Amino acid sequence: MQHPTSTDIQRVREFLLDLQARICAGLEQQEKAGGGTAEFIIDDWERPEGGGGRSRVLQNGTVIEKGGVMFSHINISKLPASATERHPQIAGAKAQALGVSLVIHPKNPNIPTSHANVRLFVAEREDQDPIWWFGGGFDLTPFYPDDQDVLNWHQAAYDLCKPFGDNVYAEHKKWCDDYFYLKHRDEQRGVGGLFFDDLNCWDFETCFKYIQAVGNGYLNAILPIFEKHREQPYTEAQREFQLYRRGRYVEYNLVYDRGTLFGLQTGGRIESILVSLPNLAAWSYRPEWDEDSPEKRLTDYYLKPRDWLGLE
Amino acid sequence: QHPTSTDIQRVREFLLDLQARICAGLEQQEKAGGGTAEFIIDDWERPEGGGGRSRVLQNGTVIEKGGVMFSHINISKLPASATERHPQIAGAKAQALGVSLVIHPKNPNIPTSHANVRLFVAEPIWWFGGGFDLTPFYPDDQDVLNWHQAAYDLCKPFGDNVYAEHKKWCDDYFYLKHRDEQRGVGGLFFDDLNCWDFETCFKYIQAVGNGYLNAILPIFEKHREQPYTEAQREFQLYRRGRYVEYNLVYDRGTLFGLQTGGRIESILVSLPNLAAWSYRPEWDEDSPEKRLTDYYLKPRDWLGLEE
């Protein structure tokens, strides 16, 4: 009945701020290992409705070309109709939300773009228990995919999900594939990972332990992929293909991503919302690649839903 | 009984010739600047009937990317608003024909620009749509005034209120709500145009389409050889990100085409070859970069008609 209490919210808040700090530190170690000096600069801000956030943004880097790791903890006054549809008892409640969202675009085409999010929503009414749920996930967006990295990414997700239930990875992996689909291109955005929302089916502390496992799991899975490819050479053609593929990432976020669109429509903090867009992206008319090329294999093989771990 | 099938064919011949003349005029600027890129023809057909001619210039010296796109097709899906504004079209055989273009110059001193002229017919219920608009990076006051004067002059024979209405409609439509910015310095925009007899409406889209070409070429000629810095190039790429945001978040034709299985590569030819995004850039208030948004990308009474 109690959970989440204000003490529970504070524990989640402290976890999220520390996770933001540790993700920035781990990625910054990669920037410095490649001879860079760019940092995830802190921009703290406040919302008049209440609360605020800490944005940490690295630009013009040597290894991380652009990255944002974004914390917020705010009062909520507008929700998408789906949330109120899926949870009708939040109507007329005081609500708050807290989370970390991140998108990292490496300079080297041999390291994928990646994204993660972990968040908690709580709606409180007089004489009613709080209504709450968590959401989050992580996902990998390659340009020159490496089979072993895709398997290790999915194995990391499978292993962190296992203690919560033998069905959790399968459900959240499928949800990630279903969500990150670019309908007008008939392509997946990437090679997937985990995605979930409306998570309140386990007791509160089990759900908080899950978002810890997902957030920490993103960091522990992404750093080895940086380390593997940081110094790997690439050609000007591969840079051009990366910029062309980044145009697909912009198309997903501006046409399909529910959080981005809701934020743009309701007067959210536009510069923090659109930190997910890469520093540079390209579009060209009707390019072609040869049948046996890695560029063609990216869309023919990797950007379709696949049973990477052979579970089925 | 207008438009007859003969009338549709007259409109089609006008549109194809307009596409040819726009590509030729812009190609002359490409060659004047030492370039060799051309608006390459891609002809295509659609099983439901009809098809189009796409003409696309890539990797140019003066035109960095440009598409001048003709289509004439049988239409089966229409946006909710079209059936709402014209409820009799429900259940009719329909067709649509038009030219749409977006031109992105290499030199930041030449604005991006856009134009469209089109006709819809349901068998008949018919209407035209179209307009043109200018998207600068380093605006030039005289060019903005000349662009608007060209629009004012071509509208005049159709009525003393036509420019005012289609200029306001352009400002209202090309607004980026989430940035609280106009897309550009405006021009003309109109849809559902069937309030004059058919031939007067056809003469209007001729004036609009020809007017785009006659107004854009002097702006290319004025600035083609004008030097620019690396910082101005970077600002142009950053500003092109706003163009992508408008077309993917607000442009009704783009969104409808993406949602309904249209020809995606033709639809998205409007996006520039390269665009940039950055977090919280700042420019001093005295700079041209800040004046672009503080002054030019707001609705303005350029010609003084409302004073």
Side-chain angles (χ1 to χ4, degrees), chain B residues 5-45 47 49-57:
Chain B
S5 61
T6 285
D7 295 324
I8 292 173
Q9 180 60 30
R10 296 164 51 222
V11 175
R12 176 186 168 93
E13 290 172 9
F14 167 73
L15 294 168
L16 284 166
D17 181 70
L18 178 67
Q19 167 180 56
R21 287 187 287 108
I22 291 172
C23 291
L26 292 170
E27 181 62 28
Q28 188 277 339
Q29 289 293 319
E30 176 69 12
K31 290 188 201 136
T36 60
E38 307 273 357
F39 290 88
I40 297 175
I41 289 166
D42 175 16
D43 288 335
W44 52 273
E45 295 174 349
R53 167 163 285 189
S54 299
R55 291 195 63 188
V56 183
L57 187 163

Short mmCIF file of all heavy atoms in Angstrom, two decimals, chain B residues 5-57, unseen atoms left out:
data_model
loop_
_atom_site.label_atom_id
_atom_site.label_comp_id
_atom_site.label_asym_id
_atom_site.label_seq_id
_atom_site.Cartn_x
_atom_site.Cartn_y
_atom_site.Cartn_z
N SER B 5 -11.59 16.21 -70.18
CA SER B 5 -10.32 15.49 -70.28
C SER B 5 -9.30 16.30 -71.06
O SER B 5 -8.09 16.21 -70.79
CB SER B 5 -10.53 14.11 -70.89
OG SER B 5 -11.05 14.23 -72.20
N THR B 6 -9.76 17.07 -72.05
CA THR B 6 -8.89 17.99 -72.76
C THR B 6 -8.28 19.02 -71.82
O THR B 6 -7.11 19.39 -71.97
CB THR B 6 -9.68 18.66 -73.89
OG1 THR B 6 -9.85 17.70 -74.92
CG2 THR B 6 -8.94 19.88 -74.44
N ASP B 7 -9.07 19.51 -70.86
CA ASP B 7 -8.52 20.46 -69.91
C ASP B 7 -7.43 19.81 -69.07
O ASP B 7 -6.39 20.42 -68.82
CB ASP B 7 -9.62 21.03 -69.03
CG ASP B 7 -10.60 21.86 -69.81
OD1 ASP B 7 -10.18 22.55 -70.76
OD2 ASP B 7 -11.78 21.82 -69.48
N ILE B 8 -7.65 18.56 -68.63
CA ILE B 8 -6.62 17.90 -67.82
C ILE B 8 -5.34 17.75 -68.62
O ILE B 8 -4.23 17.93 -68.10
CB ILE B 8 -7.13 16.54 -67.30
CG1 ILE B 8 -8.24 16.75 -66.28
CG2 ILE B 8 -5.97 15.73 -66.70
CD1 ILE B 8 -8.91 15.42 -65.84
N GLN B 9 -5.48 17.44 -69.90
CA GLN B 9 -4.31 17.29 -70.76
C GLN B 9 -3.57 18.62 -70.95
O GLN B 9 -2.34 18.65 -70.96
CB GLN B 9 -4.74 16.63 -72.07
CG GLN B 9 -3.64 16.40 -73.08
CD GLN B 9 -2.52 15.49 -72.59
OE1 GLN B 9 -2.70 14.59 -71.76
NE2 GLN B 9 -1.31 15.76 -73.11
N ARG B 10 -4.31 19.74 -71.10
CA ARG B 10 -3.65 21.05 -71.12
C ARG B 10 -2.87 21.31 -69.82
O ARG B 10 -1.74 21.83 -69.85
CB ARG B 10 -4.70 22.16 -71.35
CG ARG B 10 -5.39 22.08 -72.69
CD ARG B 10 -6.67 22.94 -72.70
NE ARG B 10 -6.38 24.28 -72.22
CZ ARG B 10 -7.17 24.97 -71.39
NH1 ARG B 10 -8.31 24.44 -70.94
NH2 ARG B 10 -6.81 26.19 -71.00
N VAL B 11 -3.46 20.98 -68.67
CA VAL B 11 -2.75 21.16 -67.40
C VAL B 11 -1.51 20.28 -67.35
O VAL B 11 -0.43 20.73 -66.95
CB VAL B 11 -3.68 20.92 -66.20
CG1 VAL B 11 -2.88 20.99 -64.88
CG2 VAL B 11 -4.84 21.94 -66.21
N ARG B 12 -1.64 19.03 -67.79
CA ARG B 12 -0.50 18.11 -67.79
C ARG B 12 0.63 18.63 -68.68
O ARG B 12 1.81 18.59 -68.28
CB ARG B 12 -1.01 16.75 -68.26
CG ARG B 12 0.09 15.72 -68.40
CD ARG B 12 -0.46 14.44 -69.01
NE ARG B 12 0.63 13.56 -69.40
CZ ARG B 12 1.11 12.61 -68.62
NH1 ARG B 12 0.58 12.39 -67.43
NH2 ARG B 12 2.12 11.88 -69.05
N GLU B 13 0.30 19.16 -69.86
CA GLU B 13 1.35 19.66 -70.75
C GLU B 13 2.02 20.89 -70.17
O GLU B 13 3.25 21.05 -70.28
CB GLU B 13 0.74 19.99 -72.10
CG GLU B 13 0.34 18.73 -72.86
CD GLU B 13 -0.43 18.99 -74.12
OE1 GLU B 13 -0.55 20.16 -74.56
OE2 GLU B 13 -0.92 18.01 -74.70
N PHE B 14 1.23 21.75 -69.52
CA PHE B 14 1.83 22.88 -68.84
C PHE B 14 2.81 22.41 -67.77
O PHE B 14 3.93 22.93 -67.68
CB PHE B 14 0.78 23.79 -68.21
CG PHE B 14 1.39 24.78 -67.26
CD1 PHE B 14 2.14 25.86 -67.75
CD2 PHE B 14 1.35 24.57 -65.88
CE1 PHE B 14 2.78 26.72 -66.89
CE2 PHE B 14 2.00 25.43 -65.01
CZ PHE B 14 2.73 26.50 -65.50
N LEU B 15 2.39 21.46 -66.94
CA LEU B 15 3.24 20.99 -65.83
C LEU B 15 4.54 20.36 -66.33
O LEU B 15 5.63 20.63 -65.79
CB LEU B 15 2.46 20.01 -64.95
CG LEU B 15 1.28 20.60 -64.19
CD1 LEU B 15 0.44 19.48 -63.61
CD2 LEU B 15 1.77 21.59 -63.09
N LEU B 16 4.46 19.52 -67.37
CA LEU B 16 5.68 18.91 -67.90
C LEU B 16 6.62 19.96 -68.48
O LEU B 16 7.84 19.89 -68.29
CB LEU B 16 5.32 17.87 -68.97
CG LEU B 16 4.78 16.56 -68.38
CD1 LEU B 16 4.14 15.73 -69.50
CD2 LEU B 16 5.91 15.77 -67.66
N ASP B 17 6.08 20.94 -69.21
CA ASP B 17 6.93 21.99 -69.74
C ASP B 17 7.52 22.86 -68.63
O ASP B 17 8.69 23.27 -68.70
CB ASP B 17 6.14 22.81 -70.75
CG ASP B 17 6.98 23.90 -71.37
OD1 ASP B 17 7.88 23.56 -72.15
OD2 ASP B 17 6.75 25.09 -71.06
N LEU B 18 6.73 23.12 -67.58
CA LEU B 18 7.25 23.89 -66.46
C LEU B 18 8.42 23.16 -65.79
O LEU B 18 9.46 23.77 -65.47
CB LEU B 18 6.13 24.12 -65.43
CG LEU B 18 6.56 24.90 -64.16
CD1 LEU B 18 6.96 26.37 -64.44
CD2 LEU B 18 5.50 24.84 -63.07
N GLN B 19 8.27 21.83 -65.56
CA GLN B 19 9.38 21.04 -65.02
C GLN B 19 10.63 21.16 -65.88
O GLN B 19 11.74 21.41 -65.38
CB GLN B 19 8.94 19.58 -64.87
CG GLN B 19 10.08 18.63 -64.61
CD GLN B 19 9.61 17.19 -64.49
OE1 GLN B 19 8.96 16.64 -65.40
NE2 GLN B 19 9.95 16.55 -63.36
N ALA B 20 10.46 21.07 -67.21
CA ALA B 20 11.59 21.18 -68.13
C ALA B 20 12.27 22.54 -68.01
O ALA B 20 13.51 22.62 -67.94
CB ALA B 20 11.17 20.88 -69.57
N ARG B 21 11.47 23.62 -68.00
CA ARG B 21 12.02 24.97 -67.97
C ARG B 21 12.68 25.29 -66.63
O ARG B 21 13.71 26.00 -66.60
CB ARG B 21 10.94 26.00 -68.27
CG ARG B 21 10.51 26.01 -69.74
CD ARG B 21 9.54 27.17 -70.05
NE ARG B 21 8.21 26.91 -69.48
CZ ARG B 21 7.69 27.53 -68.43
NH1 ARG B 21 8.36 28.47 -67.77
NH2 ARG B 21 6.47 27.21 -68.03
N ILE B 22 12.13 24.79 -65.51
CA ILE B 22 12.77 25.03 -64.22
C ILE B 22 14.12 24.31 -64.17
O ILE B 22 15.12 24.89 -63.75
CB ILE B 22 11.84 24.60 -63.06
CG1 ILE B 22 10.64 25.56 -62.98
CG2 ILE B 22 12.63 24.59 -61.69
CD1 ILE B 22 9.56 25.09 -61.98
N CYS B 23 14.16 23.05 -64.60
CA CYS B 23 15.44 22.33 -64.59
C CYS B 23 16.45 23.02 -65.48
O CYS B 23 17.63 23.17 -65.11
CB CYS B 23 15.25 20.89 -65.04
SG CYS B 23 14.33 19.89 -63.83
N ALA B 24 16.01 23.48 -66.67
CA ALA B 24 16.95 24.14 -67.57
C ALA B 24 17.48 25.45 -66.98
O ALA B 24 18.67 25.75 -67.09
CB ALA B 24 16.31 24.37 -68.95
N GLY B 25 16.60 26.23 -66.35
CA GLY B 25 17.05 27.49 -65.77
C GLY B 25 18.03 27.29 -64.63
O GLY B 25 19.04 27.99 -64.53
N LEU B 26 17.73 26.33 -63.76
CA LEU B 26 18.64 26.06 -62.65
C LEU B 26 19.93 25.42 -63.16
O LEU B 26 21.01 25.69 -62.62
CB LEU B 26 17.95 25.18 -61.61
CG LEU B 26 16.80 25.89 -60.89
CD1 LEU B 26 15.99 24.90 -60.03
CD2 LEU B 26 17.39 26.99 -59.99
N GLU B 27 19.84 24.57 -64.18
CA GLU B 27 21.05 23.98 -64.74
C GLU B 27 21.97 25.05 -65.32
O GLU B 27 23.20 24.92 -65.25
CB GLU B 27 20.66 22.98 -65.84
CG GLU B 27 21.87 22.33 -66.43
CD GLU B 27 22.66 21.52 -65.40
OE1 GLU B 27 22.01 21.03 -64.44
OE2 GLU B 27 23.90 21.34 -65.59
N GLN B 28 21.41 26.12 -65.87
CA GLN B 28 22.26 27.19 -66.37
C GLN B 28 23.05 27.82 -65.23
O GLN B 28 24.22 28.21 -65.43
CB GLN B 28 21.42 28.23 -67.13
CG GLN B 28 22.21 29.28 -67.86
CD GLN B 28 22.64 30.44 -66.97
OE1 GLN B 28 22.06 30.69 -65.91
NE2 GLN B 28 23.68 31.15 -67.40
N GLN B 29 22.45 27.91 -64.03
CA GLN B 29 23.22 28.42 -62.89
C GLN B 29 24.32 27.44 -62.48
O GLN B 29 25.43 27.86 -62.16
CB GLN B 29 22.31 28.72 -61.70
CG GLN B 29 21.41 29.92 -61.89
CD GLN B 29 22.20 31.23 -61.96
OE1 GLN B 29 23.14 31.41 -61.21
NE2 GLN B 29 21.81 32.15 -62.85
N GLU B 30 24.01 26.14 -62.46
CA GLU B 30 25.03 25.14 -62.17
C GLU B 30 26.23 25.29 -63.10
O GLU B 30 27.40 25.30 -62.65
CB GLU B 30 24.41 23.73 -62.26
CG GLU B 30 25.38 22.60 -62.05
CD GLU B 30 25.94 22.44 -60.64
OE1 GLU B 30 25.44 23.07 -59.69
OE2 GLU B 30 26.87 21.62 -60.50
N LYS B 31 25.97 25.41 -64.40
CA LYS B 31 27.07 25.54 -65.35
C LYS B 31 27.77 26.89 -65.23
O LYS B 31 29.00 26.98 -65.40
CB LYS B 31 26.57 25.29 -66.78
CG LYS B 31 26.21 23.83 -67.02
CD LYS B 31 25.92 23.56 -68.48
CE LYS B 31 25.09 22.29 -68.69
NZ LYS B 31 24.01 22.61 -69.71
N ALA B 32 27.01 27.96 -64.96
CA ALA B 32 27.65 29.26 -64.76
C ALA B 32 28.67 29.23 -63.62
O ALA B 32 29.69 29.94 -63.66
CB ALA B 32 26.60 30.38 -64.58
N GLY B 33 28.43 28.42 -62.60
CA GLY B 33 29.38 28.27 -61.52
C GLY B 33 30.44 27.21 -61.72
O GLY B 33 31.20 26.92 -60.79
N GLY B 34 30.55 26.65 -62.93
CA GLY B 34 31.60 25.69 -63.22
C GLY B 34 31.21 24.26 -62.93
O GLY B 34 32.09 23.38 -62.98
N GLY B 35 29.94 24.02 -62.62
CA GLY B 35 29.47 22.68 -62.31
C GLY B 35 29.06 21.90 -63.53
O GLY B 35 28.88 22.46 -64.62
N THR B 36 28.89 20.59 -63.34
CA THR B 36 28.42 19.72 -64.42
C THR B 36 27.24 18.85 -63.99
O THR B 36 26.77 18.02 -64.79
CB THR B 36 29.53 18.79 -64.90
OG1 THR B 36 29.93 17.99 -63.79
CG2 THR B 36 30.74 19.58 -65.43
N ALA B 37 26.76 19.00 -62.76
CA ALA B 37 25.66 18.14 -62.32
C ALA B 37 24.38 18.53 -63.07
O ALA B 37 24.17 19.71 -63.39
CB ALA B 37 25.45 18.27 -60.81
N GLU B 38 23.53 17.55 -63.33
CA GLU B 38 22.29 17.71 -64.06
C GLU B 38 21.11 17.17 -63.25
O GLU B 38 21.27 16.31 -62.36
CB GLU B 38 22.34 16.90 -65.39
CG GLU B 38 23.57 17.20 -66.28
CD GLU B 38 23.36 18.36 -67.22
OE1 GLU B 38 22.25 18.92 -67.24
OE2 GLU B 38 24.31 18.70 -67.98
N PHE B 39 19.91 17.65 -63.58
CA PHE B 39 18.66 17.08 -63.03
C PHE B 39 18.34 15.81 -63.81
O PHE B 39 17.64 15.83 -64.84
CB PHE B 39 17.50 18.06 -63.13
CG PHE B 39 17.61 19.24 -62.22
CD1 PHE B 39 18.28 20.38 -62.62
CD2 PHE B 39 17.06 19.19 -60.93
CE1 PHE B 39 18.39 21.49 -61.77
CE2 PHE B 39 17.14 20.28 -60.06
CZ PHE B 39 17.80 21.44 -60.49
N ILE B 40 18.83 14.68 -63.30
CA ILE B 40 18.71 13.40 -64.00
C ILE B 40 17.27 12.90 -63.97
O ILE B 40 16.59 12.92 -62.93
CB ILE B 40 19.64 12.36 -63.36
CG1 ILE B 40 21.11 12.78 -63.50
CG2 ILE B 40 19.44 10.92 -63.99
CD1 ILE B 40 22.07 11.84 -62.78
N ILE B 41 16.79 12.40 -65.11
CA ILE B 41 15.43 11.91 -65.24
C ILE B 41 15.29 10.49 -64.67
O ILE B 41 16.06 9.58 -65.02
CB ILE B 41 14.99 11.96 -66.72
CG1 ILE B 41 14.81 13.41 -67.16
CG2 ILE B 41 13.72 11.16 -66.90
CD1 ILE B 41 14.71 13.56 -68.69
N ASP B 42 14.26 10.28 -63.84
CA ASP B 42 13.84 8.96 -63.31
C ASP B 42 12.35 8.88 -63.63
O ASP B 42 11.54 9.49 -62.93
CB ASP B 42 14.06 8.89 -61.75
CG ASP B 42 13.55 7.61 -61.11
OD1 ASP B 42 13.28 6.63 -61.86
OD2 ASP B 42 13.47 7.54 -59.84
N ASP B 43 11.98 8.16 -64.69
CA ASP B 43 10.57 7.98 -65.01
C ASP B 43 10.05 6.71 -64.34
O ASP B 43 10.72 5.67 -64.39
CB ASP B 43 10.33 7.85 -66.52
CG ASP B 43 10.51 9.20 -67.26
OD1 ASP B 43 10.34 10.25 -66.61
OD2 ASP B 43 10.81 9.19 -68.48
N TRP B 44 8.83 6.77 -63.81
CA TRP B 44 8.26 5.67 -63.04
C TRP B 44 6.76 5.56 -63.31
O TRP B 44 6.09 6.52 -63.69
CB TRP B 44 8.59 5.77 -61.54
CG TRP B 44 8.24 7.08 -60.93
CD1 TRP B 44 9.03 8.20 -60.89
CD2 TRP B 44 7.02 7.42 -60.28
NE1 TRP B 44 8.36 9.22 -60.26
CE2 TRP B 44 7.13 8.77 -59.87
CE3 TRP B 44 5.85 6.72 -60.00
CZ2 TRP B 44 6.10 9.44 -59.20
CZ3 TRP B 44 4.82 7.40 -59.32
CH2 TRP B 44 4.95 8.74 -58.94
N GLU B 45 6.22 4.37 -63.08
CA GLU B 45 4.80 4.10 -63.28
C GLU B 45 4.24 3.48 -62.00
O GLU B 45 4.99 2.92 -61.20
CB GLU B 45 4.55 3.17 -64.51
CG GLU B 45 4.97 3.87 -65.83
CD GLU B 45 4.91 2.99 -67.07
OE1 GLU B 45 4.76 1.75 -66.95
OE2 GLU B 45 5.02 3.56 -68.18
N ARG B 46 2.93 3.63 -61.79
CA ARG B 46 2.27 3.04 -60.64
C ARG B 46 1.18 2.08 -61.13
O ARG B 46 0.39 2.47 -62.01
CB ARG B 46 1.65 4.15 -59.76
N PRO B 47 1.12 0.83 -60.63
CA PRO B 47 0.12 -0.13 -61.15
C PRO B 47 -1.31 0.42 -61.17
O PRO B 47 -2.02 0.23 -62.16
CB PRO B 47 0.26 -1.36 -60.24
CG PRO B 47 1.62 -1.23 -59.64
CD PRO B 47 1.96 0.24 -59.57
N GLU B 48 -1.73 1.13 -60.11
CA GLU B 48 -3.07 1.71 -60.08
C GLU B 48 -3.32 2.68 -61.23
O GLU B 48 -4.48 3.04 -61.47
CB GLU B 48 -3.31 2.43 -58.75
N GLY B 49 -2.28 3.11 -61.94
CA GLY B 49 -2.43 3.93 -63.13
C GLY B 49 -1.64 5.21 -63.05
O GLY B 49 -1.59 5.86 -61.99
N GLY B 50 -1.04 5.62 -64.17
CA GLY B 50 -0.24 6.83 -64.16
C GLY B 50 1.17 6.58 -63.65
O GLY B 50 1.68 5.45 -63.65
N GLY B 51 1.79 7.66 -63.19
CA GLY B 51 3.18 7.61 -62.74
C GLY B 51 3.75 9.02 -62.67
O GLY B 51 3.02 9.99 -62.45
N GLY B 52 5.07 9.12 -62.86
CA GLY B 52 5.68 10.43 -62.71
C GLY B 52 7.03 10.50 -63.39
O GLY B 52 7.57 9.50 -63.88
N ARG B 53 7.55 11.73 -63.45
CA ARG B 53 8.91 11.99 -63.90
C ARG B 53 9.60 12.76 -62.78
O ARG B 53 9.21 13.91 -62.49
CB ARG B 53 8.92 12.83 -65.18
CG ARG B 53 10.31 13.39 -65.51
CD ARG B 53 10.38 13.83 -66.96
NE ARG B 53 10.48 12.66 -67.83
CZ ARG B 53 10.73 12.71 -69.13
NH1 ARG B 53 10.86 13.91 -69.74
NH2 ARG B 53 10.85 11.58 -69.81
N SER B 54 10.58 12.13 -62.12
CA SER B 54 11.39 12.78 -61.10
C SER B 54 12.68 13.28 -61.74
O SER B 54 13.31 12.56 -62.50
CB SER B 54 11.70 11.81 -59.95
OG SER B 54 10.47 11.37 -59.35
N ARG B 55 13.07 14.51 -61.47
CA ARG B 55 14.34 15.03 -61.98
C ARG B 55 15.16 15.52 -60.80
O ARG B 55 14.74 16.44 -60.10
CB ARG B 55 14.12 16.13 -63.03
CG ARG B 55 13.51 15.52 -64.29
CD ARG B 55 13.60 16.46 -65.47
NE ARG B 55 14.98 16.74 -65.81
CZ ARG B 55 15.38 17.63 -66.71
NH1 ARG B 55 14.49 18.29 -67.48
NH2 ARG B 55 16.68 17.86 -66.83
N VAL B 56 16.29 14.87 -60.56
CA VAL B 56 17.03 15.07 -59.32
C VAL B 56 18.49 15.36 -59.64
O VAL B 56 19.16 14.58 -60.33
CB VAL B 56 16.89 13.86 -58.38
CG1 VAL B 56 17.62 14.12 -57.06
CG2 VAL B 56 15.40 13.59 -58.14
N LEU B 57 18.98 16.47 -59.11
CA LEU B 57 20.38 16.87 -59.21
C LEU B 57 21.04 16.63 -57.86
O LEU B 57 20.55 17.15 -56.84
CB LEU B 57 20.45 18.35 -59.65
CG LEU B 57 21.84 18.92 -59.97
CD1 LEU B 57 21.71 20.20 -60.78
CD2 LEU B 57 22.65 19.18 -58.68
#
